[PDB]
Curated annotation (Swiss-Prot), chain A:
Residues 44-184 form the Nudix hydrolase domain. Mg(2+) 1 binds at residues 83, 103. Enzyme that can either act as an ADP-sugar pyrophosphatase in absence of diphosphate or catalyze the synthesis of ATP in presence of diphosphate. In absence of diphosphate, hydrolyzes with similar activities various modified nucleoside diphosphates such as ADP-ribose, ADP-mannose, ADP-glucose, 8-oxo-GDP and 8-oxo-dGDP. Can also hydrolyze other nucleotide sugars with low activity. In presence of diphosphate, mediates the synthesis of ATP in the nucleus by catalyzing the conversion of ADP-ribose to ATP and ribose 5-phosphate. Nuclear ATP synthesis takes place when dephosphorylated at Thr-32. This is ADP-sugar pyrophosphatase. GO terms for biological process: ATP generation from poly-ADP-D-ribose; chromatin remodeling; D-ribose catabolic process; nucleobase-containing small molecule metabolic process; nucleoside phosphate metabolic process; nucleotide metabolic process; ribonucleoside diphosphate catabolic process; ribose phosphate metabolic process. Its main location: nucleus. The gene is NUDT5.
Length: 194, 194
């Protein structure tokens, strides 16, 4: 029984905007909230995709393919699933395969696509689809993968074994100032907890 | 070999601000990024998110989640119990406190992540992911008393760990809720550990 009453623009950049949200609380009292949105969302069912890329190779343990890059908002390097915004008219699956090839060089196969899931719902309306993709690392096309990074894109690939992901992430965090993404960490914790 | 040169305040609310970050790209070219930050960090991270593993003998292990209206999303979200870390509170103490306020359950700390980023292309927001076990057979967890702060209105949803991804997909399809990306990532890895 809660709902939005109004959304007032506070400040609008090229990429991000701040809004004052008025909503009805369950007691029937009007309250406000400071909300972040992207300016880039048209008809996409989500802002972006994140890819869970499972690298599969005969007589190898499965690896989870990750990317390391400088994130200006963090003032530092972050370890994340490959990810990007969905272009206008692009499907989440095409966006996922495209961003995975651009960021890692690998050509994946779709396994499954989540519904739109929320990035930080107390702060922002941002959403992604989480797209699971398998990579046949025995295919010649996946032998010597070269990232195809766009303008102002500078991405390092880190493939870690699924069977040891949390400890391998911990070893990278111990050896440097970097930040692991919360989704990557959540995924690694569940692999341990299973 | 990338770094921050300057941060320009664009707009400062009570809770959130928008900044224009100037940074050095790895080619030696100066570039700008629109960044979001919270105004409330004075802590290891902005917040905590709790993975609450409800353990009851002769029952399936459950993950305890919360459903709340999220003004930025304009709708109801399913999330790990979570909130901001109080000035001079430890992440572990914030985790047990928020779990009790949001669910009424009294838990034990199992493990605590390093600070992990929420949406590092958008914001500098970080949390600690705190794994907590709940002895659902203890008298203190018989009839759990959730203590909502002013303007919090939280429903508790306990789902079985070994079916988590299927149960969340079902809630999305029937209830038109948005699942949190960390919750979804956790659920995926429980299935992928196979
Ligand atoms: O208006 C808000 N925006 C973002 N985070 C918030 C956290 C607490 C609060 F009461 C209000 C807000
Ligand atoms: O300045 C940005 N802020 C947030 N997201 C962005 C996504 C792509 C881009 F080129 C620029 C931005
Ligand atoms: Mg990207
Ligand atoms: Mg990209
Ligand atoms: Mg909360
Ligand atoms: Mg509180």
């Amino acid at each position: 029984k809660q709902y939005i009453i109004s959304e007032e623009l506070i400040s609008e950049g090229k990429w991000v905007k701040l809004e004052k949200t008025t909503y009805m609380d369950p007691t029937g009292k009007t309250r406000t909230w400071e909300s972040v949105k992207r300016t880039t969302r048209k008809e996409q069912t989500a802002d972006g995709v994140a890819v869970i890329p499972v690298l599969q190779r005969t007589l190898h343990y499965e690896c989870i393919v990750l990317v390391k890059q400088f994130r200006p908002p963090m003032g530092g390097y972050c370890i994340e699933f490959p990810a990007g915004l969905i272009d206008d008219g692009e499907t989440p699956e095409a966006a996922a395969l495209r961003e995975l090839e651009e960021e890692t060089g690998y050509k994946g196969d779709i396994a499954e696509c989540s519904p739109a899931v929320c990035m930080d719902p107390g702060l922002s309306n941002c959403t992604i689809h989480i797209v699971t993709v398998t990579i046949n690392g025995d295919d010649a096309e996946n032998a010597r993968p070269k990232p195809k990074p766009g303008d102002g894109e500078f991405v390092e690939v880190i493939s870690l074994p699924k069977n040891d992901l949390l400890q391998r992430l911990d070893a990278l965090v111990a050896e440097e100032h970097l930040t692991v993404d919360a989704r990557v960490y959540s995924y690694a914790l569940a692999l341990k907890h299973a």
